[PDB]
Amino acid sequence: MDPSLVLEQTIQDVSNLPSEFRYLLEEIGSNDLKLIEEKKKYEQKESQIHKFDKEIKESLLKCQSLQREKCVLANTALFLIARHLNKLEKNIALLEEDG
Template sequence: MDPSSVLDQTIQDVSNLQAEFTHILGEIRASDTQLLDQRKKYMQKDSQIHKFIRQHGSLQEHPKEQELSEKIREKMSACKNLQEQKCTMANTALYLVAKHLSRLEKNIGLLEEDGLLAPV
């Protein structure tokens, strides 16, 4: 084991990392755009209920409150699903880089022990 071979091996291991990150972060953004769209829709419905309450007080129910509430809950659930997917993608990106970093740190440690790596 020497710095050159460790470097070659690591470069090979991380050769796809940039593309993976670009893809994952792009997917996170796309999902976020969808999520914002869904959120905008349920906020519009929510504001319909609140507008009615402001005009008529909270004791009188909006004629379509049940229907609106159900739709709002559906959209919120859809948003939550999208967000869970985003969390998974973000954790995947973290795992990918952490895996390579950990391996490199281990190899650097071994090279330093053998005195094969020039000091910083």
């Protein structure tokens, strides 16, 4: 009864994990907002050179501000999958004690 009944708690723990992955659907849906804006932020940089200083030096504030919002979805996507993954093998280590 020891290497069997704990598998039911594995079910309920990763139960909200696809809904957690459904929260990533907003997060990967958030890449529609800014990576297309990444295509559209380019139009005020190369078109303003024009066969060669407030638009060349201070233009980094339009670039440095955008890298903050991409990171919250990035690394947090990993560790949730890790606790979707890695905690099973400690229970498998209980299952490895028998067949």
